[PDB]
């Protein structure tokens, strides 16, 4: 007779809808009936805004488009992608100001309770126009800018509007925000009232920096006594006297004694045997000063020699250490003595990633297996002494807990032998990352990441060991090298057709190098044979000279036949004339050109395609 779900007290229907996290499902639920629409709108916790909020279509939506509980608002993907949003800079000063105030007021109308904001941010007047409505509640701000820093702005001006007005601010995410290190130093050292309260800081700066110097990191830390999480790229090259050494690390630890997450990395060019200015004794003193540390990354190109006693200190002084990533630390585990040594002493480790440890052996892995009995995730990168015998033993010892494995650029670990060596956890492994080197199901494998050299084929992967993957839902494929093959030779994407639930693909050719057309054809051929492919992220290759990364016509022709695609994101550009071809994908909904690499092209028609895309009667 009646509906039991609709006979529930409305607060319980809301409680049900609060557990539905898949967006498409939330949208379908809102279409079921009036009562579920109301429950969906009332409980949505996050939203990534799609389209142009400057348009009449957005500004004159009804009172019913209202999300009272929404906490996370992502504005960084509004159309046109990467354009200034609510900027005061002329591209009549009172007409701009009035239209900006109206858009901001409407955003606050739709999203009253925002505590977390992501925004594409071309200049600081964007922030000055968005903050006043949410300044009481705004706890977390993420800034995105792949474009150039506007040359005329004073030092620190990008961050000023946040620091002057947002008293609830605790977390600042600049991982994908291109600015200068000087900007960060100037802002964060001259705003003590904002800065004293910060708990989280990501300073990635779109990975387009040589790294923070000692004279920059010292003052930032000094101004941020409350930091719990710091992610930063640093200058570690001892040829520069302002590099980060023992003294700078110790200043960091004593200025930020509450740190639980600390991830420091050295940015590198391809154009490495020299030692860092970091010593074992220095790290011992450093770990002693960080008793609350749980998550530690130090990913260097420069070497820290004989690192075992520092790892022993880490275990003693940081008893809650769980997640550990180390790059160019040598002698992490020698397995040369009766007692367990180095990293094998850290009993609490739940993840361990070791890069460029040149004396890590099979004996080291055996020791790590016994010492680190909680290891759920394990990775080696550029560890050239490790053999399949070592991997096999490790996988066997860690059978109760080991769920994620990464093996990359290890000379004695070719793909066939590596996949065979993982046989003890083949039924349990959930995630695998490997680079492919050429000469009974993967029952729990949900996620697969592959690295290739240019021109290398994918096909041999199936017979090398990955032929049955019944729950594999996502694959990431990255191609490195210089492109600058027989004409019926193809990469072999269609050999992934035997995977029954493969829905999501990342195909990244950005570093793979007319001629580019034939390469796109080589890589994309057979993509239509992936019958359950639902979401594609495609990064076209760079041409050495030109600023754009073009999706060529052969690539368009190939992607067009992917009948199941719901979501298509192209990390580059294509001709306007190629756009209509994508409309013939019957249920395609989300499509965007995202030039999210530095420096992003300054764009001088997408909006009309976007209306064509929204006008089709696609499935709900």
């Amino acid at each position: 007779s009646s509906s039991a779900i609709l006979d529930l007290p409305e607060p319980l229907l809301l409680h049900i809808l609060s557990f539905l996290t898949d967006v498409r499902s939330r949208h379908r639920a809102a279409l079921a009936c009036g009562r579920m629409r109301a429950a969906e709108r009332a409980t949505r916790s996050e939203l990534s805004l799609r389209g142009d909020p400057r348009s009449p279509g957005f500004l004159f939506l009804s009172h019913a488009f209202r999300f009272p509980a929404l906490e996370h608002l992502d504005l960084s993907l509004v159309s046109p992608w990467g354009h200034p949003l609510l900027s005061s800079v002329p591209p009549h000063p009172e007409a701009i100001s009035e239209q900006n105030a109206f858009i901001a007021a409407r955003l606050a109308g739709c999203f009253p309770a925002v505590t977390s904001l992501a925004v594409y941010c071309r200049d600081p007047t964007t922030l000055a126009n968005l903050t006043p409505h949410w300044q009481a509640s705004l706890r977390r701000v993420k800034l995105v800018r792949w474009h150039q820093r506007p040359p005329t702005l004073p030092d620190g001006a990008d961050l000023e509007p946040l620091l002057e007005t947002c008293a609830a601010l605790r977390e600042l995410d600049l991982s994908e925000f291109y600015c200068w290190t000087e900007d960060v130093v100037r802002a964060l050292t001259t705003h003590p009232s904002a800065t004293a309260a910060l708990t989280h800081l990501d300073l990635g700066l779109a990975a387009a920096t040589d790294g923070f110097k000692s004279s920059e990191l010292g003052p930032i830390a000094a101004s941020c006594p409350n930091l719990r999480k710091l992610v930063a790229p640093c200058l570690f090259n001892p040829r520069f006297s302002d590099c980060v050494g023992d003294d700078a690390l110790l200043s960091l630890a004593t200025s930020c004694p509450r740190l639980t997450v600390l991830r420091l990395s050295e940015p590198f060019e391809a154009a490495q045997r020299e030692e860092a200015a970091i010593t074992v004794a220095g790290l011992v003193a450093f770990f002693a000063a960080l008793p609350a540390l749980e998550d530690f990354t130090m990913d260097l190109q420069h070497n820290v020699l004989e690192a075992a006693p520092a790892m022993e200190a880490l275990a003693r002084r940081c008893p809650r250490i769980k997640f550990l990533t180390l790059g160019s630390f040598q002698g992490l585990c020698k397995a040369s003595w009766l007692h367990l040594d180095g990293v094998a002493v850290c009993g609490g480790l739940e993840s361990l990633y070791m890069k460029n440890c040149q004396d890590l052996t099979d004996a080291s892995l055996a020791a790590i297996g016994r010492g680190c009995r909680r290891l759920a995730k394990f990775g080696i990168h550029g560890c050239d002494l490790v053999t399949s015998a070592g991997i096999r033993r490790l996988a066997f010892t860690l059978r109760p807990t080991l769920k994620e494995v990464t093996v990359l650029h290890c000379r004695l670990l070719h793909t066939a032998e590596c996949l065979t060596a993982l046989s003890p956890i083949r039924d349990r492994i959930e995630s695998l990352e490997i680079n492919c080197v050429w000469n009974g199901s993967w029952e729990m494998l949900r996620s697969l990441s592959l690295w290739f050299s240019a021109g290398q084929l994918l096909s041999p992967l199936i017979s090398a060991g990955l032929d049955s993957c019944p729950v594999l839902e996502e694959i990431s494929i990255k191609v490195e090298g210089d492109c600058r093959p027989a004409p019926r030779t193809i990469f072999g994407l269609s050999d992934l057709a035997g995977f029954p639930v493969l829905a999501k693909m990342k195909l990244d050719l950005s570093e793979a190098v007319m001629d580019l057309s034939l390469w796109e054809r080589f890589y994309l051929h057979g993509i239509e044979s992936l019958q359950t492919l639902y979401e594609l992220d495609y990064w076209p290759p760079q041409d050495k000279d030109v600023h754009h990364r073009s999706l060529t016509l052969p690539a368009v022709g190939l992607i067009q036949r992917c009948v199941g695609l719901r979501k298509l994101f192209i990390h580059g550009t294509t001709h306007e004339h190629f756009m209509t071809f994508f409309l013939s994908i019957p249920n395609l909904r989300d499509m965007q050109l995202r030039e999210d690499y530095y420096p992003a092209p300054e764009n001088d028609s997408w909006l009309r395609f976007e209306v064509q895309l929204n006008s089709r009667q696609i499935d709900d």
């Binding site: 039991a4 279409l31 629409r37 805004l49």
Partner: protein, 127 residues
Amino acid sequence: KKIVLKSSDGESFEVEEAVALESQTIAHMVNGVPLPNVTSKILAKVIEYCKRWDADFMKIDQATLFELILAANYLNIKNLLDLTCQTVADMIKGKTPEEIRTTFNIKNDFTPEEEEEVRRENQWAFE
């Protein structure tokens, strides 16, 4: 010490005081506890849950699920309420609007223009 609970059918249940404390409605009650809103069939399932996977415990028909939601809410057992409500959300996930309607026996109360209004609103969020 063991405490006695009465269902709507009349029948009585003897439970440990640690078990009954899981219901904050029971904890507030300061011979034994009458619960006129909970049937014996459903109270037995509540008691079974309150012994401290539950994926197995959720292998029940739709009517029992919704009665268990009502009971978990009348009693104040946050964890059971969460589990039962998550299970309904999993039933909604992956279904078309018609399949949602069919599963829960929901009547479409939308005008054709209201339906298009919802659809147009949905377009402002990425999936």
